[PDB]
Every structure is written in C-alpha cells, then in structure tokens.
mmCIF file of C-alpha atoms in Angstrom:
data_model
loop_
_atom_site.group_PDB
_atom_site.id
_atom_site.type_symbol
_atom_site.label_atom_id
_atom_site.label_comp_id
_atom_site.label_asym_id
_atom_site.label_seq_id
_atom_site.Cartn_x
_atom_site.Cartn_y
_atom_site.Cartn_z
ATOM 1 C CA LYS A 1 29.026 -87.931 104.766
ATOM 2 C CA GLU A 2 25.880 -85.872 105.478
ATOM 3 C CA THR A 3 24.458 -82.804 103.764
ATOM 4 C CA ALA A 4 23.857 -79.519 105.622
ATOM 5 C CA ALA A 5 20.104 -80.172 105.764
ATOM 6 C CA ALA A 6 20.645 -83.738 107.014
ATOM 7 C CA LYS A 7 23.070 -82.500 109.673
ATOM 8 C CA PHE A 8 20.450 -80.030 110.934
ATOM 9 C CA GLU A 9 17.909 -82.844 111.247
ATOM 10 C CA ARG A 10 20.380 -84.991 113.205
ATOM 11 C CA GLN A 11 21.510 -82.184 115.503
ATOM 12 C CA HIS A 12 18.199 -80.383 116.044
ATOM 13 C CA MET A 13 15.111 -82.408 115.140
ATOM 14 C CA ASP A 14 13.237 -84.680 117.551
ATOM 15 C CA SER A 15 9.598 -84.808 116.464
ATOM 16 C CA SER A 16 9.103 -88.146 118.273
ATOM 17 C CA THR A 17 8.790 -86.589 121.736
ATOM 18 C CA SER A 18 6.368 -83.751 122.521
ATOM 19 C CA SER A 19 12.988 -86.530 130.987
ATOM 20 C CA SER A 20 15.890 -85.301 133.128
ATOM 21 C CA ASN A 21 18.091 -87.877 131.372
ATOM 22 C CA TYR A 22 16.943 -86.788 127.882
ATOM 23 C CA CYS A 23 19.945 -84.642 126.912
ATOM 24 C CA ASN A 24 22.472 -87.177 128.252
ATOM 25 C CA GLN A 25 20.913 -89.821 125.992
ATOM 26 C CA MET A 26 20.189 -87.594 122.979
ATOM 27 C CA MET A 27 23.512 -85.742 122.834
ATOM 28 C CA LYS A 28 25.242 -89.128 122.798
ATOM 29 C CA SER A 29 22.858 -90.901 120.384
ATOM 30 C CA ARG A 30 22.969 -88.008 117.898
ATOM 31 C CA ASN A 31 26.785 -88.169 117.912
ATOM 32 C CA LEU A 32 27.231 -84.706 119.408
ATOM 33 C CA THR A 33 29.821 -85.971 121.911
ATOM 34 C CA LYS A 34 32.295 -87.780 119.639
ATOM 35 C CA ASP A 35 35.105 -85.243 119.184
ATOM 36 C CA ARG A 36 34.230 -83.409 122.401
ATOM 37 C CA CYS A 37 31.238 -82.548 124.577
ATOM 38 C CA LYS A 38 29.251 -80.045 122.502
ATOM 39 C CA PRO A 39 28.704 -77.184 125.033
ATOM 40 C CA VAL A 40 25.095 -76.371 124.101
ATOM 41 C CA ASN A 41 22.476 -77.753 121.705
ATOM 42 C CA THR A 42 18.738 -77.434 121.058
ATOM 43 C CA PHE A 43 16.231 -80.069 119.938
ATOM 44 C CA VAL A 44 12.898 -79.103 118.376
ATOM 45 C CA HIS A 45 9.793 -81.170 119.142
ATOM 46 C CA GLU A 46 7.703 -80.146 116.128
ATOM 47 C CA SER A 47 7.154 -81.859 112.781
ATOM 48 C CA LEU A 48 9.875 -81.548 110.146
ATOM 49 C CA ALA A 49 7.336 -79.849 107.873
ATOM 50 C CA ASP A 50 6.587 -77.197 110.515
ATOM 51 C CA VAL A 51 10.289 -76.457 111.044
ATOM 52 C CA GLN A 52 11.069 -76.375 107.309
ATOM 53 C CA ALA A 53 8.153 -73.915 107.035
ATOM 54 C CA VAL A 54 10.089 -71.436 109.205
ATOM 55 C CA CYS A 55 12.245 -70.697 106.144
ATOM 56 C CA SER A 56 9.321 -68.738 104.681
ATOM 57 C CA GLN A 57 8.412 -66.951 107.926
ATOM 58 C CA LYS A 58 9.902 -63.878 109.688
ATOM 59 C CA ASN A 59 13.212 -62.815 108.131
ATOM 60 C CA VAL A 60 15.644 -61.683 110.843
ATOM 61 C CA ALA A 61 19.373 -61.035 111.064
ATOM 62 C CA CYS A 62 21.544 -64.021 112.011
ATOM 63 C CA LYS A 63 23.894 -63.763 114.985
ATOM 64 C CA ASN A 64 26.807 -63.905 112.521
ATOM 65 C CA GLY A 65 25.531 -60.911 110.561
ATOM 66 C CA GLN A 66 24.156 -62.862 107.598
ATOM 67 C CA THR A 67 20.590 -62.151 106.479
ATOM 68 C CA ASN A 68 19.325 -65.698 105.925
ATOM 69 C CA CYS A 69 17.719 -66.312 109.320
ATOM 70 C CA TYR A 70 14.030 -66.793 109.991
ATOM 71 C CA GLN A 71 12.018 -66.665 113.194
ATOM 72 C CA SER A 72 8.944 -68.862 113.697
ATOM 73 C CA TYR A 73 5.619 -66.998 113.914
ATOM 74 C CA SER A 74 4.372 -69.444 116.548
ATOM 75 C CA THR A 75 6.179 -70.759 119.616
ATOM 76 C CA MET A 76 7.578 -74.274 119.350
ATOM 77 C CA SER A 77 8.269 -77.015 121.868
ATOM 78 C CA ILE A 78 12.034 -77.229 122.356
ATOM 79 C CA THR A 79 14.591 -78.762 124.699
ATOM 80 C CA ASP A 80 17.807 -76.969 125.577
ATOM 81 C CA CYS A 81 20.854 -79.044 126.479
ATOM 82 C CA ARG A 82 23.591 -77.323 128.474
ATOM 83 C CA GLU A 83 26.779 -79.027 129.644
ATOM 84 C CA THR A 84 27.360 -79.133 133.406
ATOM 85 C CA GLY A 85 30.597 -78.273 135.191
ATOM 86 C CA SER A 86 31.034 -81.834 136.465
ATOM 87 C CA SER A 87 30.825 -83.026 132.849
ATOM 88 C CA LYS A 88 34.199 -84.323 131.668
ATOM 89 C CA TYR A 89 34.800 -85.987 128.284
ATOM 90 C CA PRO A 90 34.112 -88.749 127.307
ATOM 91 C CA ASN A 91 31.419 -88.776 130.013
ATOM 92 C CA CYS A 92 29.480 -85.725 128.835
ATOM 93 C CA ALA A 93 26.745 -84.644 131.263
ATOM 94 C CA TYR A 94 23.893 -82.273 130.394
ATOM 95 C CA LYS A 95 21.031 -80.382 132.020
ATOM 96 C CA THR A 96 17.705 -80.952 130.233
ATOM 97 C CA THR A 97 15.448 -77.886 130.093
ATOM 98 C CA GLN A 98 12.075 -77.892 128.320
ATOM 99 C CA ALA A 99 10.535 -74.686 126.967
ATOM 100 C CA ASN A 100 8.102 -73.197 124.454
ATOM 101 C CA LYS A 101 9.765 -70.423 122.455
ATOM 102 C CA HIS A 102 10.041 -69.048 118.930
ATOM 103 C CA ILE A 103 12.998 -70.533 117.069
ATOM 104 C CA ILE A 104 15.402 -68.797 114.676
ATOM 105 C CA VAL A 105 17.062 -70.882 111.961
ATOM 106 C CA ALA A 106 19.358 -70.129 109.027
ATOM 107 C CA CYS A 107 18.125 -71.450 105.680
ATOM 108 C CA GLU A 108 19.956 -72.252 102.454
ATOM 109 C CA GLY A 109 19.723 -74.213 99.222
ATOM 110 C CA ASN A 110 17.170 -75.366 96.680
ATOM 111 C CA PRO A 111 14.973 -76.545 98.298
ATOM 112 C CA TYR A 112 15.380 -73.691 100.792
ATOM 113 C CA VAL A 113 15.639 -75.545 104.117
ATOM 114 C CA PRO A 114 17.082 -75.107 107.643
ATOM 115 C CA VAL A 115 20.839 -75.674 107.908
ATOM 116 C CA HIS A 116 21.687 -74.026 111.251
ATOM 117 C CA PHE A 117 19.871 -73.410 114.561
ATOM 118 C CA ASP A 118 20.627 -69.809 115.467
ATOM 119 C CA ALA A 119 18.631 -69.048 118.606
ATOM 120 C CA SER A 120 15.395 -69.352 120.536
ATOM 121 C CA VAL A 121 13.508 -66.277 121.775
#
C-alpha cells in the first residue's frame, strides 16, 4: 500500500520527459484524480538520484513550520499542474506549465529521502 518515499516518486517524479495535454494524462495515470481532482501538483523532470540528493542540500523551513525541508542548489526542470475552472470530477482538466526553478522537498527516514514536495522557487 505504498511507502512515503514511493508515494513521492508516483506523485512527483517524471524523469522520462525533459505537451499541453501532459497534466491531463499524468494526473490521471498517476492516480491523482481517483478520490477527487487534486487541485495542484508538480512533476520533476530530473533523475531520481538528483532529486534524492536535494535531501543533503540547502536546509530551509517547511511551509508547515517543520525544519526538514531542503532547497535544490541548482534549478530543475519541472511541470506545474493546476486545475481549471471548467474541470469537474471525474473529468479533471489541468493547465500544463513548464518551468525551471529550484525545488523544496521534505525529507525523512533512513535512508533520508524525499517524502513531500513543498514548493518551487
């Protein structure tokens, strides 16, 4: 039934790609529209190793006040998925926006790996 690290990979990792229909396909294929249309989500187009490496990079405060968040030293290729107004469950519609920004992830466990995508700056 998935571990926290595995869930992060399913919800936020897409190393395969470096379209306008991307989010519609991805949000559905990654099961992010089963219980409802997940409002917003971010996919990272970098290797798993490079993202896991962020856990040893810049320590920053998490949006929730916890101290286990880390910001990438280099910018990363990411895709932001935001639900449109016309989007009505179960036909979830999203706007695909590409960008190159630094990512902030929360890390936990042994091995210390990403378990939550906190923000992109």
